[PDB]
Amino acid sequence: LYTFKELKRATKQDTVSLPKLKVALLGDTATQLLATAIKGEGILRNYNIELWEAEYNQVERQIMDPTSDYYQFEPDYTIIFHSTHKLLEKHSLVNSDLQNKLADDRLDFVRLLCEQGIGRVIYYNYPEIEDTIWGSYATKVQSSFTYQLTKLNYELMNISQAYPNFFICNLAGISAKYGRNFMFDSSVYVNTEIILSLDALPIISSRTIDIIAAIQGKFKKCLILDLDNTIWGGVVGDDGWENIQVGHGLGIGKAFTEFQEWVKKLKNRGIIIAVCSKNNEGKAKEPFERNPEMVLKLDDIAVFVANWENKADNIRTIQRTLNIGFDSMVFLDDNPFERNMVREHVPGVTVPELPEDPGDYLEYLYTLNLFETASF
Numbered sequence: 454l455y456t457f458k459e460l461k462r463a464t465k466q467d468t469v470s471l472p473k474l475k476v477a478l479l480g481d482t483a484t485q486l487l488a489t490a491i492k493g494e495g496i497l498r499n500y501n502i503e504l505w506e507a508e509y510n511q512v513e514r515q516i517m518d519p520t521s522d523y524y525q526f527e528p529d530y531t532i533i534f535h536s537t538h539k540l541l542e543k544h545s546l547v548n549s550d551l552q553n554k555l556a557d558d559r560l561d562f563v564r565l566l567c568e569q570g571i572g573r574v575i576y577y578n579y580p581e582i583e584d585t586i587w588g589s590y591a592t593k594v595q596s597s598f599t600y601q602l603t604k605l606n607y608e609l610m611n612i613s614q615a616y617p618n619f620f621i622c623n624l625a626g627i628s629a630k631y632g633r634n635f636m637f638d639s640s641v642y643v644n645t646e647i648i649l650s651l652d653a654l655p656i657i658s659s660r661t662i663d664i665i666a667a668i669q670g671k672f673k674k675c676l677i678l679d680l681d682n683t684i685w686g687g688v689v690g691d692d693g694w695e696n697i698q699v700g701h702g703l704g705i706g707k708a709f710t711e712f713q714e715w716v717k718k719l720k721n722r723g724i725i726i727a728v729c730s731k732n733n734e735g736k737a738k739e740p741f742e743r744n745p746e747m748v749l750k751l752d753d754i755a756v757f758v759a760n761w762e763n764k765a766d767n768i769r770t771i772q773r774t775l776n777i778g779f780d781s782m783v784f785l786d787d788n789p790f791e792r793n794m795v796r797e798h799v800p801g802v803t804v805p806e807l808p809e810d811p812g813d814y815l816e817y818l819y820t821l822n823l824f825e826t827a828s829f
């Protein structure tokens with residue numbers, strides 16, 4: 454993640470070398486900063502982004518008019534930003550008959566957009582704004598904003614499964630973590646029509662570019678794990694295989710269990726898992742083999758490297774074994790010196806700056822969206 458300042462600075466960089474992509478952005482709130490952020494983020498991801506911005510609140514206007522500037526632009530990607538905030542206003546101004554059709558009408562427009570067949574579409578879904586008009590009782594009232602929005606987000610996912618060209622960017626899931634209190638800045642919105650806060654902007658640009666990059670064929674394929682204090686608490690060489698911290702019951706071992714469960718999901722979706730550890734190989738494998746509380750087993754690990762050599766060399770060994778790019782690899786290690794040396798000595802490998810407390814690893818990894826993809 455970058456700051457908006459860094460993203461804007463990047464838009465000034467020399468773009469000659471980079472492959473060009475034409476990106477259209479159309480929204481119902483003010484999009485000028487988001488445009489800058491997307492363009493700069495793309496450049497930092499090695500794309501020369503030519504970004505066309507529709508005029509304020511002309512989404513339907515541009516898409517509905519075949520002679521419009523939008524179609525003349527012939528974009529490679531079309532990013533649509535329909536905000537929950539503006540949909541909330543739309544809903545509030547109509548009677549129950551039209552409110553009952555809020556989701557359906559929006560879904561119709563989305564399908565119409567998909568049917569045009571114009572490059573790939575990236576579409577932000579809708580974080581819930583609970584209006585508390587009914588309280589929680591809103592779930593029982595079809596015409597309520599809460600019901601319509603829940604229906605809308607569900608059917609949007611079904612649209613993405615029907616149209617290979619249509620990608621959602623999960624603004625809703627992103628916002629669920631940070632909260633609207635952080636994502637939305639009322640004072641700025643009132644005076645500028647900008648709906649995302651300054652600190653939210655780089656989060657959304659990064660998540661938008663993650664999708665574009667994945668479609669272009671740049672996505673992570675492999676996760677490399679340290680062992681001690683990364684996937685279990687403690688040091689196996691000193692404490693023994695029976696004594697590593699993992700499993701339910703109170704305390705940090707539970708965090709390692711839940712973290713291993715995340716790794717298990719990656720393996721189950723085709724991510725290659727490798728181990729790279731400063732350990733005797735026999736000792737390093739023992740917990741996988743003997744400790745029943747391990748979630749990960751040896752058969753989940755494609756390449757297992759445990760020795761006393763520097764991890765940079767070991768990662769080259771792993772890369773050569775797998776024949777995938779260093780830039781398709783993620784390396785997780787609790788030791789800052791190990792992280793820093795892999796960063797310096799194996800450029801291309803992504804090395805997340807894990808927080809010191811293992812109880813915070815997973816929520817931190819969530820902020821990085823490491824495993825965006827574009828195929829099942």
Ligand SMILES: [Mg+2]
Pocket residue numbers: 679680681682683786787788
């Ligand atoms: Mg370690």
Ligand SMILES: [Mg+2]
Pocket residue numbers: 679680681730731732
């Ligand atoms: Mg280790």
